[PDB]
Amino acid sequence: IPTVIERAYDIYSRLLKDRIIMLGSQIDDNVANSIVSQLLFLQAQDSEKDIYLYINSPGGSVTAGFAIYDTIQHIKPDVQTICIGMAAAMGSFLLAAGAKGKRFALPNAEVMIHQPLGGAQGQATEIEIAANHILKTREKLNRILSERTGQSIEKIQKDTDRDNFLTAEEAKEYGLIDEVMVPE
Amino acid sequence: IPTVIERAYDIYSRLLKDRIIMLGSQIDDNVANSIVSQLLFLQAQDSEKDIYLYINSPGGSVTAGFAIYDTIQHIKPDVQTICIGMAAAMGSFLLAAGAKGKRFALPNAEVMIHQPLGGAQGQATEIEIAANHILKTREKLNRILSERTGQSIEKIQKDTDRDNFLTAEEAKEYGLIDEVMVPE
Amino acid sequence: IPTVIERAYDIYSRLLKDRIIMLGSQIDDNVANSIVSQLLFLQAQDSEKDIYLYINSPGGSVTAGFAIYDTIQHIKPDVQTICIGMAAAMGSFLLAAGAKGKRFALPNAEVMIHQPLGGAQGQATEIEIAANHILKTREKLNRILSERTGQSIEKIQKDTDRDNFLTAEEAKEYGLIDEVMVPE
Amino acid sequence: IPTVIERAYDIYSRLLKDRIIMLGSQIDDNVANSIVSQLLFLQAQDSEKDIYLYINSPGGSVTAGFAIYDTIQHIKPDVQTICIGMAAAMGSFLLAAGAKGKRFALPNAEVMIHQPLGGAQGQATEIEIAANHILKTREKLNRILSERTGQSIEKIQKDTDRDNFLTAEEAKEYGLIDEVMVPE
Amino acid sequence: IPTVIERAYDIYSRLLKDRIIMLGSQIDDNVANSIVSQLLFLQAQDSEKDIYLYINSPGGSVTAGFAIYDTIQHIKPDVQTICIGMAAAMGSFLLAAGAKGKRFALPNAEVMIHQPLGGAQGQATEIEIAANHILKTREKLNRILSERTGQSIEKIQKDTDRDNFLTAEEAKEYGLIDEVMVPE
Amino acid sequence: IPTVIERAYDIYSRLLKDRIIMLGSQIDDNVANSIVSQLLFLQAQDSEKDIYLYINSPGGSVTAGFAIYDTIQHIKPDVQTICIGMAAAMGSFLLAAGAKGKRFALPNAEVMIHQPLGGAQGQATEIEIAANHILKTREKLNRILSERTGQSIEKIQKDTDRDNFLTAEEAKEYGLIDEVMVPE
Amino acid sequence: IPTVIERAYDIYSRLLKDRIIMLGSQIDDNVANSIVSQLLFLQAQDSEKDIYLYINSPGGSVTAGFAIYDTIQHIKPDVQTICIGMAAAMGSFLLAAGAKGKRFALPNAEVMIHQPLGGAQGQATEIEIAANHILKTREKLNRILSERTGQSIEKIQKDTDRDNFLTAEEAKEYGLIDEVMVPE
Amino acid sequence: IPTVIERAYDIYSRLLKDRIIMLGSQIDDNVANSIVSQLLFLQAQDSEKDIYLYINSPGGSVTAGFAIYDTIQHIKPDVQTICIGMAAAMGSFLLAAGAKGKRFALPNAEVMIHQPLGGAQGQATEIEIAANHILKTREKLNRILSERTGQSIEKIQKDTDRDNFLTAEEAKEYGLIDEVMVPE
Amino acid sequence: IPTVIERAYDIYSRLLKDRIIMLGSQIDDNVANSIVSQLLFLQAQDSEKDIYLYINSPGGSVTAGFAIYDTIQHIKPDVQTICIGMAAAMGSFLLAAGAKGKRFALPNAEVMIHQPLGGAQGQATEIEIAANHILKTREKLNRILSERTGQSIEKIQKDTDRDNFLTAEEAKEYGLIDEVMVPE
Amino acid sequence: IPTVIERAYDIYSRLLKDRIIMLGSQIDDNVANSIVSQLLFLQAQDSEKDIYLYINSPGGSVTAGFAIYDTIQHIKPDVQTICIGMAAAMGSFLLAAGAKGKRFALPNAEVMIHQPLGGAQGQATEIEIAANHILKTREKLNRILSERTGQSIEKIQKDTDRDNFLTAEEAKEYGLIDEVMVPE
Amino acid sequence: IPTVIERAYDIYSRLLKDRIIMLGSQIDDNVANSIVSQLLFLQAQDSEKDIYLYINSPGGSVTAGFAIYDTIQHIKPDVQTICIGMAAAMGSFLLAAGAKGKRFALPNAEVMIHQPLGGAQGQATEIEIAANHILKTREKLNRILSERTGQSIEKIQKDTDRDNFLTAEEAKEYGLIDEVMVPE
């Protein structure tokens, strides 16, 4: 909303100039499309200086999440992830997707992990196709999460059966983040 | 709707007196509950004289259908099934469930068979449970249909993949009915 | 709506006692189910004395109509058809379905014939299936109409491409009715 | 609404016993169907004693009106028509359709005549068919009205171009009624 | 819906005369009130001759179910339970509540068990109260179910975590029913 | 819903003949008005033989409840109260209002007590008047409840601050009922 | 809304130039995302000169509030908090989170504290998870509030059971603010 | 809406340059937030030259009003208030809040004072809290009004019981304004 | 949404300066019209340097898709296609439409192919026209897909009968893409 | 949507600078008013250099279409028409209206021709006026189409009776376009 | 919609620079306000050089029309009117209001004239007032139209009784326009 002088920016654009990206909403195709564009742009500016991705998100579309995830992995700069407020579902997935050693959460931020949600309507055959797809998506999520937390696929499976709320400390213990940023 | 004298009946009740049951609507728990009750009543009246079930139905709930199906098989009297207009989905299933040799259709009546429809919302686990259930329901339907038409399970599976519209002649050929009642 | 004494009837029931059936509405599964029931009941009462079906109807469900059509052909008594007001679409089909020599229309009654309407939603394959089904239903209707009017299938096809309004005299000329009842 | 003893009637049924029919609503297929049924019933009871049709109606379906009209002409008993309140559009058409010499109005009743209303949606071809039909219906209405009032088709055409409100005296002068019933 | 002569009954009341009760809908306060009232009436008629409760129900209100359950246990007559179609959730609970040795299902009937569903809105304190209540209700349900199936509380808890669909044979194996009524 | 023969009743009327009243719904003016009428009628029939009031109710209007409460106290017959399913709020108030020594609950019935709910919209002065009224209503309820359970006003006040769920045993311990009817 | 010249600003941006942030709305993810961004930007500009946060807010999302809270604590500059109008719920939480000695309220500003609100729908297990989470969230809030006011956890718990409205003086007395700014 | 050149302004901004603020709408949190910001900005520009607040408002949120009121009293410049059109409820409150000797109304402007409005939903306890809060708010309003008009608290209480419409002269007589600006 | 300095751009425009186009939404006439314009503009800028089209789309209008497809083939520069997130239906069609050797997907991107969806309402003749058109469209799509993947028309037809979800690797194996971009 | 630098343009304006006009939407009075303005402006710039009109449109208002049509014929520069995606109804009319020899379609673009659609509500007289108007409009359209394609009026009449889908090649064969632009 | 460079304009403003006004919408108070303003502006710029008013309008408010009409007559420059597409009702009124000798239509443009439309609700006296006013407005319209076309008031009255559609040639013959602009 508010504007800054230098030429005129909105507050987010001003921060973007310092290689900061704010994710402050649910993740859908628009948000993903914006985040990805910001990442590509920041790389084209300087492919050495690393990027800061603040995350306060309830989650959202799994494929939209992957567009962000893959883009983070694909670019040269390290992307630091900093969780403020809440990082849930696909949000926490992205939190854990920051460059290793540079994934943070503020002391009172919360992390939640759980299985993906979906739906299927129609013929038995169609429902089967949808069910297979969502189960396959869960495997893919769990696999990549296993790699980035160091937890086994079996433990992830069990821990994400229902909503699982984690404190910043517990999140660190789990391997979703590296450090909880103690007040300076 | 209209009334007959003898004591006063509505037209359907009057026909019930002659052991005739009209199925003229979609199949849901109320309809099943009424059809089942009529069947049990008719048996208590006379367990020898057979029963006439006219069927003009687009189908409906699979479990509500099975209430009717199982009740037909469970009582002593033979239940003749006569398709007028249309017998689709669970409706055609019930057509096929009449006493062997006594399943009829009028010359211009239509029969349609296809796979069951359903839906699943929520977690991956939840969707899987629903998917398994509807696929299991399809096997059950196909198995019972195989027994009453004499067609193989494999053929039924292929033939019900999409909407399959059958003429009265084709329905006899298929083994869903025994005879097409030629005008007297 | 109104009641008659003898025991108490509604006006339609009173007329049913004289073997008169009123069709005064669009044709759907409920209406068909009731008309069919009346026909079956009337035959059980006396299978010789013929039946009077007055028709004032804009049409409706093709399958519902066939339930009626087939039942008329199936029972022993002749069913006279008498068109008052309007007999359109499936309504004029049934007008033409009365016993030969006993299909009437009052002088200012109207008849309208046209092709069947429908709809299809979804995948290309599904639309195809629906399209084939409605084309096949049209052939069925045209064939039967051909038989009852004496007009060729080709002429019927052409004449029902769009809405075709006929006067009582034109309907007689076409072979949909036999006589126009001149005022007594 | 209210009930009378003798066996139990509703008020309209009690009056039907005296060969009185009440038309107190707009004319549609249900209403027609009921009025027609009453007429046929009354004839079957006694084909000599004449019938009283009270009319208070804003009009309605032209075809539904013709069902009534043609039925009045077709039966043996004279039908007196007595306008109370308002007889408009198809309503006034029916008022004029009573047996000659026996078409009445009460002193403060109103009559209104005007052209038929309708609609057409779709392709140019479709609109043309609809336009032709409604113009033909207007000719039909004007022709019959000419016959019953004694006014020329050209005068009727001009007088019904817009809404035309008539007093009871003016209605008599026009030939829609024979007598205005002066208070006894 | 339909009527039987003897005096006039509706089909359900006619069956009630033979000590049969139909449960054909979801269970709520109205349904319970009715079922309870039936049971009380049947007992007052004869406290020896046992009662037949047909069940085809998706379930519903837990407390409404308990009104039924407790009334079954409270009256003198044995209450046979016969599952037709589907008995799910509180439905299957009532199925299992029949007199021991007299709990049946038809061959293609389905049974489903799962945990109770609820909701809580408002302050943290309020949500806690609601959570405690529903957990307590679960214990109550599992405890009584344990008693009637012979399965341990721990196994019930695990088996009802998600939707659990059972065939008639599986239901008997589980101890929800005693016999699957083979077609006679 | 269902009908019984003797002359024809609905099930509830048949039970009313045995002095049994079913309360199976929320309590509002209509329900109160009906229960009150049933009580007055039963008294007029026989002022000695006591009455049975089954209660499965989530509660409802406080004043409607009092109409019932006061009528119970005002009539000569003892009114037994039997809780099946759930008696909450004004429901449990009525439960406790039965003749002392004859207030029962079935083993798995639930009781819930809590403070009354309301609303006020408008001017400060208006809101004050509403607030005073609802607080005065709470005192009245607590006072009467104190008298019938033997618990102190202060204890009631504290125990009804939030929703308070009670088992049948707990309800007996509290003094809301006298006995829990163990299965016969 | 309005614009200021210097280059063009909206009024809020103009104030942001002087290190003033306006919180004039309910707190959600957008608002948090903006406030946080403003804070980060202000720090990058000058990490010594302190920041002014005006608060007129009814509250909102607890996690969104924490994103703000943690950011305030994380940055170098002191953040003064000044309550104008109303600071309620998470609003008053943030008011109390300003740098010690620099938390103000205007003389007629109001503060309101109460427990967090939430909801849970679904299975007993799911409701339990939600209940536990909100109860934990309350502990977290009470703990941090205890630290910043100097009141014991037990007192906070009691004082936030229901809505608790405080004047500016009472808020200072409570330790939510340090000073009430007397008119200059 | 319209734009002025100098650099481009909207009309309001152009006036803001001359230290004029327009309040032309109902008072809510946005409006207050904007007015407050304008006030703070104007002071930062020049803390001597006084400020013009034109008021045409039906009133609105009491707390939003107090954010404006307190900011007026807190800043150094005098704030002149000029009522054009209508100043009602919180609107007239703010009118009376301008610097003494500099509160104006145009000759035909209207002022209306009345008590505050609100609402309370829920438990008796909850309604009581809300009632107390709104009564306390009314005292606060009345007290501050008494101070600025010179009328006793008792007189204000009586005069604001219902809607009280005042002419500009009557408003001056009451002490809400100092002068009515006679046309120049 | 956010802004960049150099002159002021939005983030997408900034990327367009580097010949990058973002497709991050469903495909309709507006989106196509924008994408086409971007392509034409980029060619007028430089007809040698190739273009980057990122694709994260659920698909959409087939004709709108073809506007893009044809424009890609029509312009001189090579158009690289890079799938991030999901490319489904017409989305995946466009993916496969990039310059050969320059069609990519990120490791966790998904591709889905299936037949086109549509609808038909109205007369039999009209439905037939619609059915023919959509079948013809499917042939067109399969044919072009066959050319770009190197798979046979027959295999495409079978593979697209229902929803077919593909991993990045599977998509490469199919011939939809050339390379999966491994993290750098 | 996106912006280009040089001074700042939106992408369409940038293309307008090169005498390109995009028609990407249905045709109504706004769209027409814009396209017309663009044509007039482009002429005032340079009356020799010809203009490029890209067309992807489902059609729309016939009179709006004529505003565009007539303006194309009225200005000096040749207007090239290029169909991308789809040109239906009035869309395809405008496609055919480009300067002879300069009417193009991309290889997979579709063209559709059919009769105009409309509606008429009201009196018979009113419907007749509407019907005449739309028939006259069809003649006008067919006439002008005849002139530009070289097909006879009678052929156009027949070919546009229903929806008529054409490929790019077929469109060329028909004389709607001159060339199909083969990929360069 | 689109933008032109010189300083930046929208297309309409660019054309306004050349003294061209586009009327491409229904006429209401906004549209009138805008057109009027453009006229006053153009006059202030140069009161000699004449103005071009293009008209494609279905009509609208009669008083809004008159604001435009009177403004045209009041200003010094000649206003040419050019009808493109359609000029109906108040649209055609304005077309005829252009400077004599400078009222044009393009060859395929349509003109339609008819009486004004309105409505009146309420008391007999209120309806009378409305009726008188709309009749007086018709006289006013007809009188002015008479003056500008040279047709008599009686002919106008007759010709506008119903919708009257005119071709460009017919319009010229009627005197609504002077010339039809043949393609250059």
Swiss-Prot record, chains A, B, C, D, E, F, G, H, I, J, K:
Keywords: Cytoplasm, Hydrolase, Protease, Serine protease
One matching Pfam family: CLP_protease
Organism expressing this protein natively: Staphylococcus aureus (strain NCTC 8325 / PS 47)
Keyword Cytoplasm: yes
Gene3D superfamilies to which the protein is assigned, alphabetical: 2-enoyl-CoA Hydratase, Chain A, domain 1 (3.90.226.10)
Subcellular location: Cytoplasm
Matches recorded under PROSITE patterns: CLP_PROTEASE_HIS (PS00382), CLP_PROTEASE_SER (PS00381)
Family: Belongs to the peptidase S14 family.
Catalytic reaction list: Hydrolysis of proteins to small peptides in the presence of ATP and magnesium. alpha-casein is the usual test substrate. In the absence of ATP, only oligopeptides shorter than five residues are hydrolyzed (such as succinyl-Leu-Tyr-|-NHMec, and Leu-Tyr-Leu-|-Tyr-Trp, in which cleavage of the -Tyr-|-Leu- and -Tyr-|-Trp bonds also occurs)
E.C. no: 3.4.21.92
Subunit structure of this chain's protein: Fourteen ClpP subunits assemble into 2 heptameric rings which stack back to back to give a disk-like structure with a central cavity, resembling the structure of eukaryotic proteasomes.
The protein's name in its UniProt record: ATP-dependent Clp protease proteolytic subunit
Species lineage: Bacteria, Bacillati, Bacillota, Bacilli, Bacillales
Sample GO molecular function, one term: ATP-dependent peptidase activity
Keyword Cytoplasm found: yes
Role noted for this protein: Cleaves peptides in various proteins in a process that requires ATP hydrolysis. Has a chymotrypsin-like activity. Plays a major role in the degradation of misfolded proteins.
Active site per the UniProt annotation: A89 (nucleophile), H114
Any single GO CC term annotated in Swiss-Prot or TrEMBL for this entry: cytoplasm
InterPro entries membership: ClpP, ClpP/crotonase-like_dom_sf, ClpP/TepA, ClpP_His_AS, ClpP_Ser_AS
SUPFAM superfamilies: ClpP/crotonase (SSF52096)
One GO term of the biological process aspect: protein quality control for misfolded or incompletely synthesized proteins
